[PDB]
Amino acid sequence: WRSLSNVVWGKDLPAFTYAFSKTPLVLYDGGTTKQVGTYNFPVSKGMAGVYMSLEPGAIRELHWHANAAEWAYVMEGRTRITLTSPEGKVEIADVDKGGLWYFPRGWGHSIEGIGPDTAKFLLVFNDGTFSEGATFSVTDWLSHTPIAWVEENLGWTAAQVAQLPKKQVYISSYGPASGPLASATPQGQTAKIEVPHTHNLLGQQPLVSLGGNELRLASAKEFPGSFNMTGALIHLEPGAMRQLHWHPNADEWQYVLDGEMDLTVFASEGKASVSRLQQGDVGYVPKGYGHAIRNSSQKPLDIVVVFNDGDYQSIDLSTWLASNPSSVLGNTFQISPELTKKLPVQDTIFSLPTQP
Amino acid sequence: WRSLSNVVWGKDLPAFTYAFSKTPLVLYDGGTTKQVGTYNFPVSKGMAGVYMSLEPGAIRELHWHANAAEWAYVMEGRTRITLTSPEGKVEIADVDKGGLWYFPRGWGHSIEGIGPDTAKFLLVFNDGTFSEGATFSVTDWLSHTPIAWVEENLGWTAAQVAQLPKKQVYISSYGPASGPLASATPQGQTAKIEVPHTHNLLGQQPLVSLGGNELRLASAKEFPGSFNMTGALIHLEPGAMRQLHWHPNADEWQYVLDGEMDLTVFASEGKASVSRLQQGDVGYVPKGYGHAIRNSSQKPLDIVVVFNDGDYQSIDLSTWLASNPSSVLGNTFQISPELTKKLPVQDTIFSLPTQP
Amino acid sequence: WRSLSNVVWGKDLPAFTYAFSKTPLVLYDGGTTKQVGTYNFPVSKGMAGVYMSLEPGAIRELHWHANAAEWAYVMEGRTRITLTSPEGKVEIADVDKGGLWYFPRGWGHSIEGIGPDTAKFLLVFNDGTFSEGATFSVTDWLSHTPIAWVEENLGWTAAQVAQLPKKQVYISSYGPASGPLASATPQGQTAKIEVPHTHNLLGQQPLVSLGGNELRLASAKEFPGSFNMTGALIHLEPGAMRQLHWHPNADEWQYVLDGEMDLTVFASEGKASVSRLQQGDVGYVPKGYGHAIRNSSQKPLDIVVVFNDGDYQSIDLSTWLASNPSSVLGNTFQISPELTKKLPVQDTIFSLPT
Ligand code: NI
Ligand code: NI
Ligand code: NI
Ligand code: NI
Ligand code: NI
Ligand code: NI
């Protein structure tokens, strides 16, 4: 990738991509997981990412984490979530392929794979240090509380408390697998959360469409329950680009759903990087850094990108240059008036291949 | 206190209690004080606590501290406060036993003991590094300003300025003791603060009551002047329990007003603690940590707890488990369907010992 | 300067002033600049300051910086700015002597000197680590992107892209100089920003005026586009002072426009400083520290001060003492009832030489 400056790509910069596709899975009874955050991907301060799979009837047990909100995208299969708020209200809902959930920091929750095959999903947390090994587990909790107090709290005998787990379960396939949603009723009378905390992203109409390239955007305008986090699906045809831009207000976390992705990141001070991501790899663009995404392959590319702000803000280079008068542009770029007039006058968000 | 995990209580964790009852008082002319913060209680990052007493006519001099808001609970006696805002408005008020004040960050204030008894009160600051040795004193200020500028600022002669203190006074019993509230008028025409910054907590009816156990809560709903701090009084009868819960949004600072308190703290990653607090000792539960409080004694227990958020948010274990369906609970806890149905179906906030 | 305590001025404290007047300029083709922030002025954590000049037709190139909002005061001459928001709207405006601009964090912008004279202005950033060497330059950007992707994004050939700069331009005099404002139209159809992000500070009537001493204040009340920063102009006559006060909510950054300024700063724990600032020097008062400013010279003093909050909050000593009853004051200061009654009963903001 030649540049006008002949910059040494990546020099004096952290990695902006991580080979998450090669990270080994941790295996549980009915599920798998792996994660990427500042502990293995130092640039990724604003968000951490978790891959999880759950077989039918496998549950990610009831837990909470007050250090991070949890935004999710279901890649394959079907899940059911439960979510309990400090007002004592509950949301119990199916989330299918292409759907989202958002669990506010510290609200209690569970996730179950409901089949018929493997559920596979991404979890993105708005704390880059988040680790799935550091969540607050209800089974860990009750096995790390004095037995006599658990007895009193539950109205249970010692012999009943002795039947509870002795350590953090994390993922269970003990069972039973949950049944139809209409029968998934709280054991005790519980009012229902009314603001939706699940959402259908893949089923949205594209916010932007150009020559088969598509952007589907779920910010707080589309999904207000996710009040401080935004997600988008980008589909790029062979040769096409998401145009050069930056985000004034948010970091950007990226996962390649399928295909092969090229990312370039401009970091100021004459420093920049370019790298290729395979399916299942991760990218991270710090707030304010200039960047673009290109499909340099002969096959389609699909990515999910996540922002740690509920308001999607992008300034495209094309918009920026179109907004300025000729004199400012010619003086800035030190170019002829003739060439100045050929700078962008409109922003199409994507760029179609121009190479004949 | 046996547990299902046989966890070594306190292993790999900071102390969550501090033997504040044994901290020596610092003695002033008509007052005493002592304090606990990150400097001696490392876990206590969000809040620091100060004990202070003032004899009749003793004043904690005019001072300010822009690094911390100041929330107070008067344990004994009567105080008079003054509070001056950047709007140039003043609040002059009596605060008696069971009452609160809240001084916003950086607003100027004073506190006087009003007789015939000694005033004793707790001050909780929303910065764990706060120290009473590091406040901005008006007598320190004027003795550390060029004399010629103090003369000009006050319209005073050298001989008048020479009568001012040469250093921080801190606490003074020079006099005069203040008279009745209705005669405590500003020396110059000063508009009055209209939003109350004092409040009666002890005189509230309980928010929650069960079997003699009581919770009185002053959040910003009850006391909007204290916009980002909340306090509560908890009364526990012998053998009774404040149920297992966590706070999604706030740290919890605790002081034992009377009795003996048992506290358990669950910190995730299979780590937990349990300890006993005597009267005048202090506890601290970091945001999100699971906790419960038990009176294991034969005498009543009374505590004050303070949160560094104005919205009280608690998720009780009972609420959480009641909100979930049987399958999720049986799978998580790996227990029989019979036992699953005996999990909580309602939240009574407190739990009671075995009854006749 | 004697004090009641005989405090050693400056003992155990950082510098609260910086000899910015002596900082050397960095020279560009058509402009100059220098800066002061935590890297050379350690106390200055909340704000950094930049001096910049632009010759007629010289431009500070299109750039952005998402780490800092940019507040400006034009000291001499005339500028033209452009400002582009994430809504895809643009503001193109003239800012002359005494005027302000505020560029929100990460919004794209440019600044051009409009002739016939040199434009000289101050930029204050709400991040004390801000450096003009660390901005995101559009010419740096396009020279540090794969050429094939620039071709695609612009619809240009390799030979067209090859005419672009090979590195960060920073300041350019290549031209052309811009024409009249009414002719400075976006190359492509662009909606206009409607909330003003420029403002006339020097032209305001004083918020406070006493004996020739004046304070002009542009907080978010006067200039709502500058939503989280405030600027003020203070004029002090010989012998006059801005009274003792503190700010509960903001740090204060100061620049001496002309004259000679005395600053005192009280830092608690029996520590305080007093320093004299020359024209072009800089002061910084941390949030909550007590302070006062005095003109101890025989000539006028004019300063600009900037706060990293959009709501100007000041508690003057006089207001505070006037708000309290006699008993509280006499007990605090350990003075006679007679002297207690002579403490302040009103706040005139400035104090006059006796
Ligand atoms: Ni979770
Ligand atoms: Ni982006
Ligand atoms: Ni105080
Ligand atoms: Ni609690
Ligand atoms: Ni700038
Ligand atoms: Ni000031």
Numbering used by the authors:
A (entry chain B), B (entry chain A): 39 to 394
C (entry chain C): 39 to 392
Provide the publication's sentences verbatim.
Here we use a cyanobacterial MnII-cupin (MncA) as a metal trap, to test predictions of metalation. Two metal-binding cupins, MnII-MncA and CuII-CucA, were discovered in the periplasm of a cyanobacterium (Synechocystis PCC 6803), notably binding metals from different ends of the Irving-Williams series yet exploiting similar folds and identical metal-binding residues. While the copper-cupin is secreted unfolded via the Sec-system, the MnII-cupin is a Tat-substrate which folds and kinetically traps the less competitive metal in the cytosol before secretion. MncA is an MnII-dependent oxalate decarboxylase (inactive with copper or ZnII), and the related cytosolic OxdC from Bacillus subtilis trapped either MnII or CoII in E. coli depending on media metal supplementation.
However, MncA might adopt non-native folds with non-cognate metals. Abnormally coordinated metals might not be kinetically trapped. NiII often prefers four-coordinate, planar geometries, and NiII-MncA was chosen for structural analysis. A crystal structure of NiII-MncA (1.6 Å resolution), shows the bi-cupin fold of MnII-MncA with a metal atom in each cupin domain. Each MnII atom is coordinated to three histidine and one glutamate residue with non-protein ligands completing hexacoordinate MnII coordination spheres. NiII-MncA has similar coordination environments with no channel to the amino-terminal NiII and a narrow channel to the carboxy-terminal site analogous to MnII-MncA. The channel is presumed to allow substrate access to catalytic MnII. The substrate site was gratuitously occupied by acetate in the MnII structure and with glycine in the crystalised NiII-form. The narrow hydrophobic channel is unlikely to allow NiII exchange and thus both NiII atoms appear trapped.
